[PDB]
Coordinates of C-alpha atoms in Angstrom, one line a residue:
Chain A
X1 CA -13.7 32.3 -95.1
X2 CA -14.1 33.0 -91.2
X3 CA -11.5 33.2 -88.3
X4 CA -13.8 31.5 -86.5
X5 CA -12.3 28.0 -87.6
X6 CA -9.5 28.3 -87.2
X7 CA -9.4 30.5 -83.6
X8 CA -11.4 27.7 -82.3
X9 CA -9.3 24.7 -83.9
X10 CA -6.3 26.5 -82.5
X11 CA -7.1 25.6 -79.2
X12 CA -7.7 22.0 -79.9
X13 CA -4.4 21.7 -81.4
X14 CA -2.8 22.9 -78.4
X15 CA -5.0 20.2 -76.9
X16 CA -3.1 17.7 -78.9
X17 CA 0.6 19.0 -77.4
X18 CA -0.9 18.6 -74.3
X19 CA -2.3 15.3 -73.7
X20 CA 0.9 14.2 -75.6
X21 CA 3.0 15.6 -72.4
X22 CA 1.4 13.8 -70.3
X23 CA 1.5 10.4 -71.4
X24 CA 5.3 10.7 -71.7
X25 CA 6.2 12.1 -68.6
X26 CA 3.0 9.4 -66.7
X27 CA 5.3 6.3 -68.1
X28 CA 8.5 7.5 -67.9
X29 CA 7.7 8.3 -64.2
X30 CA 6.4 4.6 -63.5
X31 CA 9.0 2.8 -65.4
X32 CA 11.4 5.3 -62.5
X33 CA 9.2 4.1 -60.1
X34 CA 9.5 0.1 -61.0
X35 CA 13.9 0.9 -60.8
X36 CA 14.1 2.4 -57.6
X37 CA 11.8 -0.6 -56.0
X38 CA 13.4 -2.5 -57.6
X39 CA 17.0 -2.0 -56.3
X40 CA 15.2 -2.0 -52.5
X41 CA 14.3 -5.7 -53.1
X42 CA 17.8 -5.9 -54.5
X43 CA 18.7 -4.7 -51.3
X44 CA 16.2 -6.7 -48.6
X45 CA 17.7 -9.6 -50.5
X46 CA 21.2 -8.8 -50.6
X47 CA 21.1 -8.3 -46.6
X48 CA 18.7 -11.4 -45.9
Chain B
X1 CA -7.5 24.3 -97.2
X2 CA -5.6 25.3 -94.5
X3 CA -6.7 23.1 -91.5
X4 CA -6.7 19.6 -93.3
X5 CA -2.3 21.0 -93.5
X6 CA -2.3 22.2 -90.2
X7 CA -3.8 18.2 -88.2
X8 CA -1.0 16.8 -90.1
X9 CA 1.4 19.0 -88.2
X10 CA 0.2 17.7 -85.0
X11 CA 0.2 14.5 -85.7
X12 CA 3.6 14.2 -85.8
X13 CA 4.8 16.0 -83.2
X14 CA 2.9 13.7 -81.0
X15 CA 3.9 10.3 -81.9
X16 CA 7.6 10.7 -81.4
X17 CA 7.5 12.2 -78.0
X18 CA 5.3 9.0 -76.9
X19 CA 8.2 6.8 -79.3
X20 CA 10.9 9.1 -76.8
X21 CA 9.0 8.2 -74.6
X22 CA 9.1 4.7 -74.4
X23 CA 13.0 4.5 -75.2
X24 CA 13.4 6.5 -72.0
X25 CA 10.6 3.7 -70.4
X26 CA 12.5 0.8 -71.6
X27 CA 16.3 1.9 -71.3
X28 CA 15.5 2.8 -67.6
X29 CA 13.5 -1.0 -67.2
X30 CA 16.6 -2.6 -69.3
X31 CA 19.5 -0.2 -66.7
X32 CA 17.6 -1.2 -63.8
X33 CA 17.4 -4.4 -64.7
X34 CA 20.7 -5.2 -64.8
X35 CA 22.0 -3.5 -62.2
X36 CA 19.4 -5.6 -59.6
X37 CA 21.7 -8.3 -61.8
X38 CA 24.6 -6.9 -60.5
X39 CA 24.6 -6.2 -57.1
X40 CA 23.4 -9.5 -57.0
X41 CA 26.4 -11.2 -58.9
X42 CA 28.2 -8.7 -56.4
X43 CA 26.5 -10.4 -53.5
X44 CA 27.6 -14.1 -54.7
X45 CA 31.5 -13.0 -54.9
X46 CA 31.4 -11.6 -51.2
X47 CA 29.6 -15.2 -49.6
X48 CA 33.1 -16.5 -50.9
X49 CA 35.4 -14.9 -49.8
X50 CA 33.6 -14.6 -47.1
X51 CA 33.1 -18.6 -46.4
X52 CA 36.8 -18.9 -47.9
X53 CA 38.7 -17.3 -46.0
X54 CA 36.5 -18.3 -42.1
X55 CA 37.2 -22.7 -42.9
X56 CA 40.7 -21.7 -43.3
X57 CA 40.6 -19.8 -39.7
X58 CA 39.2 -22.8 -38.3
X59 CA 40.8 -25.0 -39.7
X60 CA 44.4 -23.3 -38.9
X61 CA 43.3 -23.0 -35.1
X62 CA 41.6 -26.9 -35.0

């Protein structure tokens, strides 16, 4: 073979992990935001 | 080929991760709803106490 096939493929296999970490974090952050704001509404309401 | 092996290795990790991370974004959404729920349940309990006590006070006075 030729190492330029697998050399330039590795740097796509690397992107397939990377985009994975993104959409893991950026989803669990939204839920935490939805929980925070929900329990704030539960104060605003309780006190009212 | 060796390359046909490797593409199955990413597509395998990158589904486990995204199921784990929708099993945290589900779990949090549950525990927070059950939290929100309990913080208004406790609000219910308080109101009774403070009204049962109050009516007795104003009765005894009269």
